[PDB]
Write a protein that binds this ligand. Structure first.
Ligand SMILES: COC(=O)c1ccc(SCCc2ccccc2)c(S(N)(=O)=O)c1
Ligand SMILES: [Zn+2]
Length: 257
């Protein structure tokens, strides 16, 4: 039902998911002038040396690259987090044009796309239990700008033609997510939500300041995916981003400067 089309997009979601108008919704604009440096934040620890990718799925809205999260393999800790968060999947949001596509904005700047690495807090045992908790998930958000190609993204771009339509999947083993990180792990953090239904208020957002560069050709290939299933009229998968939501009673903290 819900999507990003002309009649089922973000402004409609509240009708099936009333939390869409909640107190800690994501994404948000990051006002860099008002984000406060927090000397008590730790450096982020991203430990992806043992990550085990399995499969890539066109989920009907984006594509998920899925990881084996049955053991402590690929974990995020440190930064603003307590305990250990296990990577379960990553996906992106992107635009129909380079001037839009990110969910978070920075001083109202939209990036071409935004990568989300989703992790769940191991103290809750599994992802389904974790999304029921205010500290259940940590999502690491990375902006994409269009410029030089990102070599470590090419393996993702090249498998997209095999999962063009909703519900298609493909084997996707041995992919190393370290190739999608920028040089600096300086970040902003704030408490928020999933940005798609069910919009649960269970996420500690960590958004890296430094964007990665991808080529125009790479993001053009994202835009050839389809929201529709096989044998249905083509709906290009573009503009699958939720706009900035009210910050309300929240502080965005900076790990730097
Ligand atoms: C276009 O965006 C997506 O396709 C997308 C898919 C998954 C997720 S996270 C898991 C959401 C979920 C689904 C079902 C049950 C409990 C949680 C997100 S985000 N931006 O991290 O909120 C976006
Ligand atoms: Zn997302």
């Amino acid at each position: 039902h819900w999507g990003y089309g002309k009649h089922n997009g973000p402004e409609h979601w509240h009708k099936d998911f009333p939390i869409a108008k909640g107190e800690r919704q994501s994404p948000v604009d990051i006002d860099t002038h008002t984000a406060k440096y927090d000397p008590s934040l730790k450096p982020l620890s991203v430990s992806y040396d043992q990550a085990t990718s399995l499969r890539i799925l066109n989920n009907g809205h984006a594509f998920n690259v899925e990881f084996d999260d049955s053991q402590d393999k690929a974990v995020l800790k440190g930064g603003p987090l307590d305990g250990t968060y296990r990577l379960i999947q990553f996906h992106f949001h992107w635009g129909s044009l380079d001037g839009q596509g990110s969910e978070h904005t920075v001083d109202k700047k939209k990036y071409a796309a935004e990568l989300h690495l989703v992790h769940w807090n191991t103290k809750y045992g599994d992802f389904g239990k974790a999304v029921q908790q205010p500290d259940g998930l940590a999502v690491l958000g990375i902006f994409l700008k269009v410029g030089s190609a990102k070599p470590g993204l090419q393996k993702v771009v090249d498998v997209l033609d095999s999962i063009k339509t909703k519900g298609k999947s493909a084997d996707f083993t041995n992919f190393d997510p370290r190739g999608l990180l920028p040089e600096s792990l300086d970040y902003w953090t704030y408490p928020g939500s999933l940005t798609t239904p069910p919009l649960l208020e269970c996420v500690t957002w960590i958004v890296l300041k430094e964007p990665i560069s991808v080529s125009s050709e790479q993001v053009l290939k994202f835009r050839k995916l389809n929201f529709n299933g096989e044998g249905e009229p083509e709906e290009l998968m573009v503009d699958n981003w939720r706009p900035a939501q009210p910050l309300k009673n929240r502080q965005i903290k900076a790990s730097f400067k």
